[PDB]
Design a protein around this ligand. Structure first.
Ligand SMILES: [Cl-]
Ligand SMILES: [Cl-]
Ligand SMILES: [Cl-]
Ligand SMILES: [Cl-]
Ligand SMILES: [Cl-]
Ligand SMILES: [Cl-]
Ligand SMILES: [Cl-]
Ligand SMILES: [Hg+2]
Ligand SMILES: [Hg+2]
Ligand SMILES: [Hg+2]
Ligand SMILES: [Hg+2]
Ligand SMILES: [Hg+2]
Ligand SMILES: [Hg+2]
Length: 358
């Protein structure tokens, strides 16, 4: 079960590359990121020294996606027990918890962050399909409950706009890096709730609006309104949020053959081909202007993911090599190195649709 899946994506390349390397990188990530300290009897994904080993719900999502793909059931279950120990009044995880297991003050730590719970829900579907739900945790039941909570609290019911939190945002402000059409199609097929297809379509419509303002680069902003225009007081640049877009959105092409995903990801990949793999930096305006110049793991792997849609498979190979080569030092070892491992799973053929023949 799990890595190596030995599956072939139905569209695009099977891999742009490995199994031994992935397992070694997983053992390293697990050693550094997983702890029982401050985990309430369970396990949690901690951030790094730069934020004093706190936990964010997104990190729980990453850890569950990784743990199921690496066939780590006992660990998955303990991570999920920590998540459940932090569901808020809406059934969505508190977004920010300190190292002592207290929800944080002054930053809306009680509220949830949609991208985290979307990943947690997808990971639960994988767990159901890979291990079955008759054991200690009924993964399928937990997934259905979470998906229902996501739809009820995190989707505008008329427009289908994805909200960034359960108690704020929507058409006046949301986050393109949270957009996950392939996840939504899986939710629709797994649960039978077809409304998730309209949520996916709305994400593509937003990206189409953003094309009016991104000067043909394929870049997306960290935050924007439903008109694809700046969200007040929030970054409109392609920075540490937006970088996840190429990862989440290329998957719809590989799993479902979505031509909108390919058209968009080809644009993004083509933009990065201007400077090449070594030239990727950690901040651009959406018109392409560099605003930061660090070359790190938060930005390389997602471009490798976008490259899966086929703009240039030779460049894709170079991006794979760069993704492997650039690993962040440990003081800042949480975010980039997590995206690196997630994207490495995808671009090596080890992130199959959980509803497919595994
Ligand atoms: Cl997963
Ligand atoms: Cl993953
Ligand atoms: Cl949206
Ligand atoms: Cl949320
Ligand atoms: Cl949406
Ligand atoms: Cl939007
Ligand atoms: Cl896309
Ligand atoms: Hg995975
Ligand atoms: Hg997975
Ligand atoms: Hg939410
Ligand atoms: Hg959306
Ligand atoms: Hg937007
Ligand atoms: Hg895309």
């Amino acid at each position: 079960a799990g890595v190596p899946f030995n599956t072939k994506y139905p569209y695009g390349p099977t891999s742009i590359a490995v199994t031994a390397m992935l397992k070694a990188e997983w053992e390293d990530w697990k050693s550094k990121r997983i702890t029982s300290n401050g985990a309430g009897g369970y396990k949690r994904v901690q951030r790094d020294a730069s934020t004093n080993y706190d936990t964010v719900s997104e990190g729980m999502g990453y850890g569950l996606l990784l743990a199921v793909c690496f066939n780590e059931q006992a660990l998955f279950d303990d991570l999920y027990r920590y998540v459940k120990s932090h569901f808020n009044g809406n059934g969505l995880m508190h977004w920010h918890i300190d190292a002592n297991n207290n929800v944080t003050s002054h930053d809306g730590g009680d509220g949830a962050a949609t991208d985290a719970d979307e990943d947690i829900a997808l990971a639960l579907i994988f767990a159901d399909k890979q291990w079955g739900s008759s054991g200690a945790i009924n993964y399928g039941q937990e997934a259905r409950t979470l998906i229902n909570n996501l739809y009820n609290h995190c989707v505008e019911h008329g427009s289908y706009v994805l909200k960034p939190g359960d108690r704020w945002g929507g058409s006046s402000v949301t986050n393109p890096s949270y957009f996950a059409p392939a996840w939504y199609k899986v939710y629709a097929q797994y649960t039978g709730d077809t409304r998730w297809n309209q949520v996916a379509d709305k994400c593509y419509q937003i990206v189409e609006e953003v094309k009016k303002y991104n000067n043909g680069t394929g870049l997306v902003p960290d935050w924007c309104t439903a008109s694809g225009t700046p969200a007040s007081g929030q970054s409109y640049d392609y920075k540490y949020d937006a970088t996840r877009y190429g990862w989440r959105t290329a998957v719809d092409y590989s799993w479902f053959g979505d031509q909108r995903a390919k058209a968009n990801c080809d644009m993004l990949t083509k933009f990065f081909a201007r400077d090449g793999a070594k030239g990727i930096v950690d901040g651009y305006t959406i018109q392409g202007s560099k605003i930061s110049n660090n070359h790190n793991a938060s930005f390389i792997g997602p471009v490798a993911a976008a490259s899966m849609t086929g703009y240039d498979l030779n460049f894709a190979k170079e991006l794979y090599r760069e993704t492997v080569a650039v690993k962040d030092s440990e003081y800042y070892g949480y975010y980039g190195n997590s995206l690196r491992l997630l994207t490495l799973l995808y671009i090596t053929g080890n992130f199959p649709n959980p509803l497919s023949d595994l």
